[PDB]
Paper text:
The recombinases Rad51 and Dmc1 are highly conserved in the RecA family; Rad51 is mainly responsible for DNA repair in somatic cells during mitosis while Dmc1 only works during meiosis in germ cells. This spatiotemporal difference is probably due to their distinctive mismatch tolerance during HR: Rad51 does not permit HR in the presence of mismatches, whereas Dmc1 can tolerate certain mismatches. Rad51 and Dmc1 sequences are evolutionarily conserved, with Dmc1 about 45% identical to Rad51 in yeast and 54% identical to Rad51 in human. Both are ATPases and require ATP or its non-hydrolysable analogs to assemble on single-stranded DNA (ssDNA) as the presynaptic complex, which leads to searching for homologous double-stranded DNA (dsDNA) in chromosomes. Here, the cryo-EM structures of Rad51–DNA and Dmc1–DNA complexes revealed that the major conformational differences between these two proteins are located in their Loop2 regions, which contain invading single-stranded DNA (ssDNA) binding residues and double-stranded DNA (dsDNA) complementary strand binding residues, stabilizing ssDNA and dsDNA in presynaptic and postsynaptic complexes, respectively.
Using procedures described previously, we obtained cryo-EM structures of the presynaptic and postsynaptic complexes of ScDmc1 wt at the resolutions of 3.2 and 3.4 Å, respectively, and those of hRAD51 wt at 3.0 and 4.0 Å, respectively; these resolutions were higher than for previously reported structures. All four helical assemblies share almost the same right-handed helical symmetry with about 6.3 protomers per turn and a helical pitch of 100 Å. In our models, ssDNA and dsDNA substrates are located in the central axis of the helical structures and stretched to form continuous triplets with DNA bases exposed for homologous pairing and search. In the ScDmc1 presyaptic complex and hRAD51 presynaptic complex with RS-1 which is a compound could enhance the DNA exchange activity, one DNA nucleotide-triplet in a B-form conformation interacts with two consecutive protomers. The compound RS-1, specifically stimulating the hRAD51 DNA binding during strand exchange, is verified in hRAD51-ssDNA-RS-1 structure that RS-1 is located close to Loop1 of the adjacent hRAD51 in this assembled helical style rather than in single protomer binding and might facilitate the stability of Loop1 region which is very important for DNA binding. The major structural difference between hRAD51 and ScDmc1 lies in Loop2 of the DNA-bound complexes. We found that the EM density corresponding to Loop2 of hRAD51 complexes is less resolved than that of ScDmc1, despite the higher resolution of the hRAD51 presynaptic complex among four 3D reconstructions. The EM densities of ScDmc1 reconstructions are sufficient to build atomic models of the intact Loop2, but several residues in the Loop2 of hRAD51 cannot be accounted for in the corresponding reconstructions, indicating a more flexible nature of Loop2 in hRAD51.
Author numbering:
A (entry chain C), B (entry chain B), C (entry chain A): 22 to 275, 283 to 338
The structure:
DNA sequence: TTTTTTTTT
């Protein structure tokens, strides 16, 4: 990803890119993917500075018709961080892909908050072992972030705890309004240094009670839409894997049906439905993935994170 | 479709047709179907160059009253690419027609992007097998284009993967503004070589979040109208089949009702409502087609694309 | 309707009537109903040739005060083609009258494009069966003309398909500018031979996207006004029935309200609001007719056109 | 004059 200063060398004033920075653009792809009104909304930017900036953004970033063979190549050179459970990796055909959005929902105690802790330490791994050689960042809305589990999985893999903890960045969000500002600050960090995956634990927990619907329902869904649209751009412009978790309602007609509705159902690329088995064993079923066929597999929650039963 | 150079042989200056080209006209039908102000808007074109160009466009393209018998003939010689599921073809009475717009909507996981992957490979087929002997082009707004499925269906039909992948053209759109520029570049390609169908996967996904309505609603609908009007001209002047997909809202009155409103409901010629059955089985119900009576049929999503259950 | 040559026998030069012909006048009523400036606008016509031509036009066409009894007679000898559904005919008190404008609007799939296909074949019928013994002409702006339905209704009534298809004339319009030229060519045909009804399917579909308002709204409405004024003269001077269809917007105040505004609302004589019932059943409600009281009735869309449920 | 959006327990 080319920094936003590379088009400063193409007839753009300095305070212009500086204002784009407070707007939130830090690379040239963030501008090339941006629509016209997103840019015009910046206060102190004309309507012709806009067509110029978009022109050199399109010059520096190819945004036209290619053919399927070149897309097939990149699709083969994606990274797909492993999950730490060999059968889960077989189900996902290699693990959580980079550059897309995954979703994990379930009743409770189903380990959807523990898979995240496992991934946050597995990402720091050489590719010959299933990692991505990049830092993680963790956005929590519940307070359930526990570094004691990262330490256990770090000992499982050999990595030192101090070296896994000069790593995954913690930010606890108190508001649906605060989540988006965290996304801005996260974009800054991800441009200044290399990151492998973002984790939004309970991406929908705060909405359920911030927006007391119905009558507030339409605004809740509109806010979710924008949040997911921002996550999508982060994924597309930084190649990071985005993993979100989701809560569950009880379908009362006379039955889990995760929350969020059609707006999250359409937005998410891959969804994983987690169940409760015997003891530590859990069942993970594939839910809405194009390439992956519908199937399910088993895994366990050990003292070292996601496992196999075991 | 006659190229735009054939009227350059009728008293038109060369830079005139060259400027029509940057305007976007590449055939004589693109000009014959164009209104007067569409042409006057081109900078460097008079108001009399306009009546001239329209005069020889109407000379080269018959645009008057015919009688029903000659329309009945062409209606019988349309192509109607097959879908790859024998019962779906029976429901559609031969498959997706060429020269019109079809629409497929549904909750999620209902295989409306998998039908697109099947069609993108079925189009490259001799007419004695249900194809159209033409390339496809795929416009994606979500990232869900996977050539791994085109490869599977190519093995089902015998065609070689390298020969199905020197084919369907991929372009990922990041903006409602970018979709239209993609349409221009697509018109260029479709005039320079033969194409069979265009696929706009998630034709309405980007609007839902680009235009945060209401107050932006009227502009969103006006942009959709122009996008669909351009698709209609592409279809009419190149005989390609246009297949678009559509998302769904939850009708909250006290219930799917696809998104887009009356502007897409009126514009689309045939609509298909997809449902979720048991396992891989899905149900496809006819929705707003003149000739086709309202009915429904079943089909399955196999490891080789759309099937039959099976 | 007397041809325009009958006043050529009253001291008018031949090239004068020939120029009136390119102007668009083909009968003496087209001139008697024409205002003065309509005629003066013809290039190569003086201002005294005008008062002369108007003088003998008024001599040949009575345009003064009559009394109500003689109007009551013609009102009783109008034709009112049937619709093909006995309850619809009871609602309309005999069907679609000749010499006026009717309007049918609705969301979509409501059969307003199928009633037109039924009428286009019902018009070719002896008066003792509800027809008008005249050809039809169909102006399409969407491409939804299907002779396969005319064939089905022709088999329902006994008439042979080849004899219903040496009949209804098809012309597809691509522009609001092209609609009017089609009207001119239609006037020529209707004077050279007998016609019973004109059908403008989607009379307002092209305006919604040709005129991107507001700022273009006032011009859009002015163009609609002229189009409807020309339809009115066609109806008055040829006794044909004019049936137009109309799309729908969503009334957003906090609700269908067809498009076109006060200009089409005032111009249309009778309006029919179509709804969606169960299965094939639809509901047709009377909307703005002087003589007809407000009421509604049911009908169905069968494999042979408009029906009864059935 | 023009333009629909949004599930929860
Ligand atoms: N240190 C540990 N060693 C072994 N098992 C543990 C440990 N910590 C938690 N568990 C188990 O992990 C299971 C999964 O809990 P958890 O993943 O936190 O719930 P969750 O998936 O986040 N759902 P939610 O309650 O909505 O957050 C629990 O039922 C515990 O029994
Ligand atoms: N390789 C595959 N083999 C078998 N089944 C598959 C395969 N890939 C995807 N599927 C199934 O295809 C189904 C349809 O998913 P998909 O068509 O991608 O959703 P969609 O129609 O595009 N709706 P949306 O989520 O809004 O894009 C999924 O539920 C999967 O179970
Ligand atoms: N051959 C047929 N046999 C039986 N029913 C049919 C047939 N063709 C179409 N229909 C039905 O006719 C209904 C009316 O569709 P149609 O009349 O074309 O829409 P419309 O009134 O023109 N509204 P619009 O979509 O804006 O054009 C559809 O819902 C179909 O189910
Ligand atoms: O994706 C966008 N921005 C963005 C911002 C921060 C990051 Br990190 C990543 C992406 C984006 C796309 C279209 C429009 Br229009 C706009 S907008 O004009 O600014 N309207 C608010 C809004 C915001 C987000 C999504 C939708 C609407 C933004
Ligand atoms: O269909 C049109 N163009 C087009 C362009 C590219 C392709 Br590929 C295919 C078609 C067209 C029709 C009428 C007018 Br008026 C115009 S306009 O003057 O240029 N206004 C903008 C606009 C654009 C599109 C639809 C509506 C309005 C364009
Ligand atoms: O109804 C008219 N003409 C016509 C033309 C073709 C047919 Br078929 C049927 C009727 C007519 C009436 C008054 C005037 Br003033 C004029 S005008 O001078 O020519 N102005 C343009 C215009 C055209 C139409 C309506 C309004 C204005 C025409
Ligand atoms: Mg899809």
């Amino acid at each position: 990803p080319q920094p936003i200063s590379r088009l400063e060398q193409c007839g753009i004033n300095a305070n212009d890119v500086k204002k784009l920075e407070e707007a939130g653009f830090h690379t040239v792809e963030a501008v090339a993917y941006a629509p016209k009104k997103e840019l015009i909304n910046i206060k102190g930017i004309s309507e012709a500075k806009a067509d110029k900036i978009l022109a050199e953004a399109a010059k520096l970033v190819p945004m036209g018709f290619t053919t399927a063979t070149e897309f097939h190549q990149r699709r083969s050179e994606i990274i797909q961080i492993t999950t730490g459970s060999k059968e889960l990796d077989k189900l996902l055909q290699g693990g959580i892909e980079t550059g897309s959005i995954t979703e994990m929902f379930g009743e409770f105690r189903t380990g959807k908050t523990q898979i995240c802790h496992t991934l946050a330490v597995t990402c720091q791994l050489p590719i010959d072992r299933g990692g991505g050689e990049g830092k993680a960042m963790y956005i929590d809305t519940e307070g359930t972030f526990r570094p004691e589990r990262l330490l256990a999985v770090a000992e499982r893999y050999g990595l030192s705890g101090s070296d896994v903890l000069d790593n995954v960045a913690y930010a606890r969000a108190f508001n649906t309004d605060h989540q988006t500002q965290l996304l801005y600050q996260a974009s800054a960090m991800m441009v200044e240094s290399r990151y492998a995956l973002l984790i939004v634990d309970s991406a929908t927990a705060l909405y359920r009670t911030d927006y007391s619907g119905r009558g507030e329902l339409s605004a809740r869904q509109m806010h979710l839409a924008r949040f997911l649209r921002m996550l999508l751009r982060l994924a597309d412009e930084f190649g990071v894997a985005v993993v979100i978790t989701n809560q569950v309602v009880a379908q009362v007609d006379g039955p889990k049906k995760p929350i969020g509705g059609n707006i999250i159902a359409h937005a998410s690329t891959t969804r994983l439905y987690l169940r409760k088995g015997r003891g530590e064993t859990r069942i993970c079923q594939i839910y809405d993935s194009p390439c992956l066929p519908e199937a399910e597999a088993m895994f366990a929650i050990n003292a070292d994170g996601v496992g196999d039963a075991k």
